[PDB]
């Protein structure tokens, strides 16, 4: 075919990622921990973070093989965060995409440890499967992954989100601060790790970071819009009204697209992903 089809592009990359994730975990003793890690890792989904990593690597001159281990690591980290967020002590979710959550199948103890095991394996996998990377670039990827997961990123975001519950002084700025930690850090790491592996310049990385921060926040504003149009927490529409929230969501997507224009037409897949994820949220 001659026509670029984003849905086909994403389906093909998703299949590459899912085959690598499945091969990454062979069952060994104790079988239950491998079963529990595979249960959540191989549950499916959009695989947005690994796809962003591979796509940003290719944008910057790299290839799928260079990015694929880091892409898998980002999905292991994403999966850990979902297992830990679903637990009874946090969101207390019995289902995820209409299937029982990890702790409901394997128990809370094994779910906690499966999350820990996926985070550990993320780091091991990046190193052992990327011998062709420049060693200093690969260490930069490790440092970025560790900073992204921890108290200054995803885990800090989870704590700021818990602290916001049932407060009367939440502002759009403080909601944005929660989201930039809880989701933005890992979306930024997804594009920046692929860029770093490919040797992208600082200037190129800054454009990719603006793209990632903008799409991440747009996704959260659109989630809030759909929730309100369908434990007390303020949301963008409850703080700003629906008119201003819809305008903000559109502005953030437009800003993400503009951020990548200076790469040229090579940026068109990343630019299209911004609008596609939003359009799919309105259809689902």
Residue reference for tokens 């965060």: 81
In the list Cl ion, a second copy, Mg ion, none, the entry touching 243 (Cβ below 5 to 8 angstroms by class) is Cl ion
Count Cβ neighbours within 10 Å for each residue of 69-92 and write b for 16 or more, e otherwise. Answer: bbbbbbbbbbbbbbbbbbbeeeee
CB of 224 to a second copy, least distance (A): 21
> If binding is defined by CB under 8 A, does position 194 make contact with a second copy?
no
What DSSP assignment string belongs to 87-128?
STTTT--SEETTEE-HHHHH-HHHHHHHHHHHHHHHHHHHHH
State which residue, 78 or 207, has the beta carbon closest to a second copy. Answer: 78
> Within positions 76 to 115, which residues make up the interface with a second copy, using CB under 8 A?
80, 84, 87, 89-90, 107-110, 112-113, 115
> If binding is defined by CB under 8 A, does position 150 make contact with a second copy?
yes
Candidates 12, 162, 228, 247; binder of a second copy (CB under 8 A) is 162
| Contact between 191 and 56 (Cβ < 8 Å) | yes
Count of residues engaged in binding a second copy, rule: CB under 8 A: 55
> If binding is defined by CB under 5 A, does position 229 make contact with Cl ion?
no
Helix (H, G, I), strand (E, B) or coil at 149: helix
User: Considering only CA atoms, which of 205, 203, 178, 175 is closest in space to residue 190?
Assistant: 205
> If binding is defined by CB under 5 A, does position 243 make contact with Cl ion?
yes
State which residue, 239 or 242, has the beta carbon closest to Cl ion. Answer: 242
- Spatial CB neighbours of 150, under 8 Å, sequence gap ≥ 6: 156
CB of 262 to Mg ion, least distance (A): 9
> If binding is defined by CB under 5 A, does position 85 make contact with Mg ion?
no
Flag whether 254 is marked binding: no
Flag whether 224 is marked binding: yes
Structural tokens at position 260:
């990548």
Candidates 67, 149, 225, 274; binder of a second copy (CB under 8 A) is 149
| Contact between 239 and 172 (Cβ < 8 Å) | yes
CB of 127 to a second copy, least distance (A): 4
> If binding is defined by CB under 5 A, does position 224 make contact with Mg ion?
yes
State which residue, 141 or 215, has the beta carbon closest to Mg ion. Answer: 215
Based on its alpha-carbon atoms, the radius of gyration of the chain, rounded to whole angstroms, reads 19
Flag whether 3 is marked binding: no
Binding residues for Mg(2+): 85-86, 91, 93, 161, 224, 261
């Amino acid at each position: 075919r001659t026509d670029f089809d984003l849905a086909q592009y994403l389906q093909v990359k998703k299949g590459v990622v899912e085959a690598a994730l499945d091969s990454s975990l062979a069952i060994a003793r104790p079988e239950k921990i491998y079963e529990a890690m595979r249960y959540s890792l191989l549950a499916g989904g959009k695989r947005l973070r690994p796809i962003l990593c591979i796509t940003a690597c290719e944008l910057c001159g790299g290839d799928e093989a260079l990015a694929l281990p880091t892409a898998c690591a980002l999905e292991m980290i994403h999966t850990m965060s979902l297992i830990h967020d679903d637990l009874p002590s946090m969101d207390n979710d019995d289902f995820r995409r209409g299937k029982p959550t990890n702790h409901k199948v394997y128990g809370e103890d094994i779910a906690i440890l499966a999350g820990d095991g996926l985070l550990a394996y993320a780091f091991e996998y990046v190193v052992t499967h990327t011998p062709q990377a420049d060693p200093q670039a690969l260490l930069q990827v490790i440092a970025r992954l560790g900073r992204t997961v921890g108290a200054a990123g995803l885990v800090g975001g989870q704590v700021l989100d818990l602290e916001s519950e049932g407060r009367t002084d939440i502002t759009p700025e403080t909601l944005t601060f929660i989201h930039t930690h809880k989701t933005g850090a890992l979306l930024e790491a997804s594009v920046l790790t692929g860029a770093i592996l490919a040797g992208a310049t600082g200037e190129q990385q800054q454009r990719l970071a603006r793209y990632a921060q903008n799409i991440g926040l747009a996704f959260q504003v659109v989630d809030d819009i759909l929730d309100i149009t369908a434990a007390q927490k303020a949301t963008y529409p409850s703080l700003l009204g629906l008119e201003a929230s819809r305008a903000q969501a559109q502005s953030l997507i437009d800003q993400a697209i503009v951020a990548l224009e200076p790469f040229g037409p090579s940026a068109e897949p990343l630019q299209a992903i911004a609008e596609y994820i939003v359009a799919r949220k309105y259809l689902e």
